[PDB]
Symmetry: C3
Subunit: 136 residues, 3 copies
């Protein structure tokens, strides 16, 4: 508690991603690992879900993750694991097609499945874990 | 498998948290990272859910997490990521109000959402990841 | 981004586990931590769920995880955290009985609960996190 190295622990916060609607940080950097909170397809300015259903929500959620990554000195190539929570399993393929446009190489490990309900009636919510570079 | 440092890996076990009802440890410390098993609002002495519904269950689950943290040389300030699994999304705000009483600063990254069912008919289950200090 | 050590980041890929059905890697090794994608009870050769329901699916999912671990220089003793996603909470005990045959000591931290639906109509999906040895 004093006998080992003191590791970085930094709260990541950017107005380019939505404000919190509960007692949480957008992301936490600890040592070099970044835990990103689950992101809905929420407009950063209004705090409400973007219109147009699951495809548009997925694009916005991933955009939000990208801005949090950038605030933490990373990009999508630093992501090592993601979780995609769906309101409808039948949206699996369509959300995958959005996802692949952001995660273009060194693809993260992943789980994707249908939950009973998301906050605000979201159709998709995406969590991620990243590691600060350099990565060989 | 012998050419790198041998990292600490320690099973965390305290009678101040409930006994296992399956093949799992309360938590695992590996290097400085602590993975805590999902905690229901179970009374540590009886192994049954405390009465009074989701608010009381959330308080008990977080109390249980606190005792596991303490057994691992940590407190709630060491938590970096939590997951709150709900039986009912409409309980989001009320569980947040309990949660904020324990996680009072450096708030963890978080995801919270409704699943189809929890063991024992629990109304809430909370998982967490912590990192042993010092943290700067 | 150049001022710290360059950590290993390696995509784990083995034909002894099923091919991807989306934009993801079977596992990612980053430093010494291995994030394994969620595994259904899919036959590695055919890419379809094995017959016989949840018990047989759980055995196949864990077999698949074991082959991914082996490709990453690990075995089941390196696992520190697992998540068991069920189509039916009433299968909790039966899946635990399969799980315990693979995870025989130093049991991982765990969460297990029922989701609304899994890809392909799977009855069980298992994710895991491991750390490369040596572990003391
Ligand atoms: Ni110390
Ligand atoms: Ni070695
Ligand atoms: Ni650098």
């Amino acid at each position: 508690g004093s006998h080992m190295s003191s590791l970085v622990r930094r709260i990541i916060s950017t107005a380019k991603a939505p404000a919190a609607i509960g007692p949480y940080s957008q992301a936490v950097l600890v040592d070099r690992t970044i835990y990103i909170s689950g992101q809905l397809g929420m407009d950063p300015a209004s705090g409400q879900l973007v219109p147009g259903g699951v495809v548009e929500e997925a694009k916005q959620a991933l955009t939000n993750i990208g801005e949090i990554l950038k605030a933490a000195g990373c990009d999508f190539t630093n992501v090592v694991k993601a979780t995609v929570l769906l309101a409808d399993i039948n949206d699996f393929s369509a959300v995958n097609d959005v996802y692949k446009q952001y995660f273009q190489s060194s693809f993260p490990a992943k789980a994707a499945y249908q939950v009973a309900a998301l906050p605000k009636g979201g159709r998709v919510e995406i969590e991620a874990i990243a590691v600060q570079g350099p990565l060989t």
